[PDB]
Design a protein around this ligand. Sequence first.
Ligand code: FAD
Ligand code: FAD
Ligand code: SMA
Ligand code: SMA
Ligand code: SMA
Ligand code: SMA
Ligand code: MG
Ligand code: MG
Ligand code: MG
Ligand code: MG
Ligand code: MG
Ligand code: MG
Ligand code: MG
Ligand code: MG
Lengths: 454, 454
Amino acid sequence: SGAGPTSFKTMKVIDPSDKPNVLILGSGWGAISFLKHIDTKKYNVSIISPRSYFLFTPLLPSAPVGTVDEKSIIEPIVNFALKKKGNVTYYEAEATSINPDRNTVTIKSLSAAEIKYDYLISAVGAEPNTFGIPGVTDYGHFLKEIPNSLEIRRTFAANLEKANLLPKGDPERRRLLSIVVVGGGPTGVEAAGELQDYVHQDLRKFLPALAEEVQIHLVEALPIVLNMFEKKLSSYAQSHLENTSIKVHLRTAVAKVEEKQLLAKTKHEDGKITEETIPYGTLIWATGNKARPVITDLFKKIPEQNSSKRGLAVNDFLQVKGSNNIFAIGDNAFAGLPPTAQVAHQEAEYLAKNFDKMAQIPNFQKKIDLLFEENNFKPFKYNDLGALAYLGSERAIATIRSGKRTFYTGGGLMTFYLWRILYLSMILSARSRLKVFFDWIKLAFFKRDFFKGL
Amino acid sequence: SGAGPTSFKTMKVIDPSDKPNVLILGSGWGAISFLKHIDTKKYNVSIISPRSYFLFTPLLPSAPVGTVDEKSIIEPIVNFALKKKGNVTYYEAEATSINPDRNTVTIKSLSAAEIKYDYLISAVGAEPNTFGIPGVTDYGHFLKEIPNSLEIRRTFAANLEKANLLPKGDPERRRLLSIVVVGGGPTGVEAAGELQDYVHQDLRKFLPALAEEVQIHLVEALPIVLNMFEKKLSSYAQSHLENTSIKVHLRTAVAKVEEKQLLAKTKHEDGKITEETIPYGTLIWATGNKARPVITDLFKKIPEQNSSKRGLAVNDFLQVKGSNNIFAIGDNAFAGLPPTAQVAHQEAEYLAKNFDKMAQIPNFQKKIDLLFEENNFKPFKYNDLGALAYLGSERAIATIRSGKRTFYTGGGLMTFYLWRILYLSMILSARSRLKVFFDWIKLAFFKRDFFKGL
Ligand SMILES: Cc1cc2nc3c(=O)[nH]c(=O)nc-3n(C[C@H](O)[C@H](O)[C@H](O)COP(=O)(O)OP(=O)(O)OC[C@H]3O[C@@H](n4cnc5c(N)ncnc54)[C@H](O)[C@@H]3O)c2cc1C
Ligand SMILES: Cc1cc2nc3c(=O)[nH]c(=O)nc-3n(C[C@H](O)[C@H](O)[C@H](O)COP(=O)(O)OP(=O)(O)OC[C@H]3O[C@@H](n4cnc5c(N)ncnc54)[C@H](O)[C@@H]3O)c2cc1C
Ligand SMILES: C/C=C(C)/C=C\C=C/[C@H](OC)[C@@H](C)[C@@H](OC)[C@@H](C)CCc1oc2c(O)c(OC)cc(OC)c2c(=O)c1C
Ligand SMILES: C/C=C(C)/C=C\C=C/[C@H](OC)[C@@H](C)[C@@H](OC)[C@@H](C)CCc1oc2c(O)c(OC)cc(OC)c2c(=O)c1C
Ligand SMILES: C\C=C(C)/C=C/C=C\[C@H](OC)[C@@H](C)[C@@H](OC)[C@@H](C)CCc1oc2c(O)c(OC)cc(OC)c2c(=O)c1C
Ligand SMILES: C\C=C(C)/C=C/C=C\[C@H](OC)[C@@H](C)[C@@H](OC)[C@@H](C)CCc1oc2c(O)c(OC)cc(OC)c2c(=O)c1C
Ligand SMILES: [Mg+2]
Ligand SMILES: [Mg+2]
Ligand SMILES: [Mg+2]
Ligand SMILES: [Mg+2]
Ligand SMILES: [Mg+2]
Ligand SMILES: [Mg+2]
Ligand SMILES: [Mg+2]
Ligand SMILES: [Mg+2]
């Protein structure tokens, strides 16, 4: 086919086939968690993704400022594939059309056909949502993929360089040193906190006059940040952010983004609506999920998905409603659950175990959930294990749970240490775990590397 | 001035001046070793260099394949500057003309004036010499600066990708997997060895068919590799290189480099001259020093330098012959010594100590060596401490000495461990030392990162 140059087929065995062809879309939390658990001797497993590596997304906000290095939080797909007992095929390409009628996926490669399947596992994720707000794509940076980390560093480094040539009182200097982060979830909060850490811990030590003039803004439409946590943790988080000099704009929406300024509209608690023009040098847009084009295209082809908006509606067995043989997990699937890596991972593990049982029942190996129900398959039940968020300045919040029971809840320095330990344990490869560990040790003794060219 | 955006002046004290203006050209072994030892309270110290960081050159051959990371072997100049007690000025620019008549250096910035001096310390180094051989600059890669490391990785990665799409017996596949390294000194030998390590230790584990078809060529005009070592070590080195499958072409000169092949001419020991067309995919040109344009320009302006070729001829006090106030150290200076980091470092330390004594004698602070001779300054005496070279496959050679006495001489696994320990001790910053240490630990457990995009 016309797939990219990082494409492969592993060769653990000599392929004759009798086995169903299982095609996975994506190389992220859902796809790779599924790959880790799927039996590649029961099924012929293929993967379509434009990205030849897994990204440990929870540490992406640490990468732009060099708290961790970009290499440390990625792992090539081939390394996961080579742990499998059977053969794995990877096509470096993006799915452009899912064709349920003829059981194929049309692919195109950026760096260059229809790929057949018996079962499809869609895990392409979601893209950042700009909500049609003008100027976001022209002037803002997303914080979603490794290239975004590099772009943010290049932008902020260039702004610091330009600001440094202007006199202390110049409003252009002040503007160039202004950062606006939109989104009060973990990504935006952690982006803000990591930037504030860089500025106050490292930049201050060699460019103190620049550092003291940096202003970080966090903008969020809801009345609180981190609304997945209990109220006292959200309040603690906001108070801490404010204590580190981050200006938090709650109940605030960005109406437009222009080149050198953006318009923020606040609906205050008293009901008044005010507008503020916020000059900015660096805009990070860290909010909103929306369905990718290949997914919104699929909505039109399955009657039961015609009303879908956020993602593919899936049943208790993670089948795409209206399809006998397409499953969806993670951010591209709507199952009434939050768009988190935790959800993607559990969905993937559940689904892989279902595929083990499916190989024992002849009807699967030759009312869409009839066979699942007749054979007494348990429905998927998400177990919320809690939530973590780094807040800058060696503070984190954490709620740790399982079922109705909460084991731990709190914030402070101890919680930051817990945050680090838990994140290390959740990294999917030993290589990436060691690299992140070393990044953090180096950080205890030395400043971060903040190089525009590396 | 019109210097680049990484330019700075440190502000340890409030500058009034009475002190001579000492201007350093470069940010490499000579310049940074000199900076480390120069008293910035006795002198107003400025630096002109287009590169805002120090490069630990002895580990550059390890960088293309990810034995070490590029970040690990560099250190920003500002970090050395901030260790000094006085103020240090850095201009991100290249010296384009040294103007001895008016005691200035003309600068231009790549990323944009005449800078005055009382004393000039030239340490701009030398550039790779192609010897006018056609095609070297069109098709070859130097191995001199960080961007070259990135370029070599991009080229070899792209070649492996292309070769992987061709059938096992295709001569284009074989060509794309052919590497030619020109130069049998430490740089070329280590480049070859590091590439052979990557191919046989890492690539082989996931692309064995590609790996087994890679051919590395080492081409050298002299009858032996590593001619700075004793004969038995050179012979051991060649034998080891050959034992790892590197084809060593001694007594061989490259007559021309074309796009897909180069012509190698061998004068055999029996006197016959043969030609071989060597197909290649990656060419690394790791031989020959030549004077940079700013230096060859200076030859014409000082009568005593009119006959100079290799570099500025310097006297026993490292003064440029024909100048009262220009000194030169490292590869841009000819003192009858080899172009090595060891020589540059000793020259720099010697010269900085001379500047300490110069500040005590009024004639320096307001026959070019008359004042040095009258005041009984000791001439510079190079102390050869030995030589080290990595050979791939966990083997190194080492000769360790001081004066007439040799403490150690040998090759093998133990010498490789010694090579690592010695290299770590010679890195100029604790940050870089820790990063290299961590790179090597990670390598003991995991494959190298060989990413075209990072
Ligand atoms: C910066 C950041 C920090 C986060 N932190 C946390 C956290 O701390 N905790 C938490 O629970 N969640 C976190 N999340 C959310 C979590 O990353 C997502 O919920 C998770 O990525 C969902 O997994 P997924 O497999 O659906 O999507 P992803 O992991 O995004 O993977 C999607 C994959 O599909 C590929 N792809 C895209 N288009 C196509 C196409 N057309 N065809 C084929 N493949 C395609 C992509 O390249 C990618 O490999 C974070 C997200 C971000 C962006
Ligand atoms: C890959 C490699 C491996 C090596 N390994 C070893 C080894 O193991 N042992 C050993 O003893 N030696 C080694 N060397 C040799 C050693 O690096 C040189 O002898 C040493 O660099 C000389 O120091 P220098 O200060 O003269 O030049 P450099 O260290 O090359 O520094 C020159 C500086 O001048 C700057 N510059 C260039 N043009 C201008 C301009 N117009 N104006 C101002 N600044 C300019 C450059 O950016 C650079 O900062 C190696 C060299 C290479 C390339
Ligand atoms: C009786 C107990 C049962 C039945 C199961 C687990 C019990 C204890 C666990 O720890 C031992 C659990 C408390 C601890 O870790 C799971 C939680 C902090 C997990 C919280 C947690 O997890 C994630 C996770 O697991 C992922 O997987 C790859 C991915 C994730 O995206 C970042 C997360 C995640 O963001 C969070 C917050
Ligand atoms: C009586 C002893 C005296 C008076 C002085 C030193 C004695 C022992 C030393 O080790 C303790 C010495 C043996 C040991 O290290 C210096 C040698 C292996 C050094 C060999 C050595 O050195 C370099 C060096 O030093 C540099 O400096 C920055 C830079 C260098 O470029 C890479 C080198 C270098 O390439 C080599 C080979
Ligand atoms: C007597 C017997 C033994 C084995 C003694 C071991 C002593 C230290 C260990 O190293 C060897 C070390 C690994 C261990 O203890 C600090 C941590 C995992 C504990 C948790 C811990 O603490 C931190 C810490 O304390 C810091 O302090 C300045 C800084 C830190 O980051 C900013 C951390 C940290 O991020 C974590 C996770
Ligand atoms: C009983 C009391 C103590 C303190 C015991 C300490 C044991 C190990 C140390 O780690 C804690 C370790 C740092 C130390 O010993 C291996 C090295 C510096 C010794 C020199 C050494 O050896 C290597 C080695 O042996 C390897 O083997 C598979 C691999 C190696 O690279 C490829 C090296 C190596 O590159 C070096 C420099
Ligand atoms: Mg995925
Ligand atoms: Mg992702
Ligand atoms: Mg998904
Ligand atoms: Mg996603
Ligand atoms: Mg230098
Ligand atoms: Mg250099
Ligand atoms: Mg020099
Ligand atoms: Mg040089």
